[PDB]
């Protein structure tokens, strides 16, 4: 099933919203670099060989 | 005794490819020693497997 991807303009605190629901289900907030990297090692990355 | 004669260079022939299978035998003891060097085992293996 869907896990609920946001649409929206990005002026919010986004990541006071992922802390709020992070406390909401007491879980651990992380953030990551996924977007804008045009480059496959922070979304895959490629097999331990290089 | 022709027989013979062709059985000696038949024989020269194998002794031949037999160090030209060494030869080319040496040359993946270098490339896999190279590789592994490079990273251990070809790329541990994976590749080769």
Known sequence: API?????????GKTSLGR???????????????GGVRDEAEIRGHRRTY | LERFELDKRVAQRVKEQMDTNQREYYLREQMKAIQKELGGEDGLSDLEA
């Not at chain 1, 609920?4 to 303009?9: I, N, R, S, W």
């Open chain 1, 4 to 12: 609920l991807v946001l649409v929206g303009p990005p002026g919010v």
């Open chain 1, 20 to 34: 709020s629901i992070a406390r909401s289900m007491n879980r651990k907030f992380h953030r990551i670099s996924l």
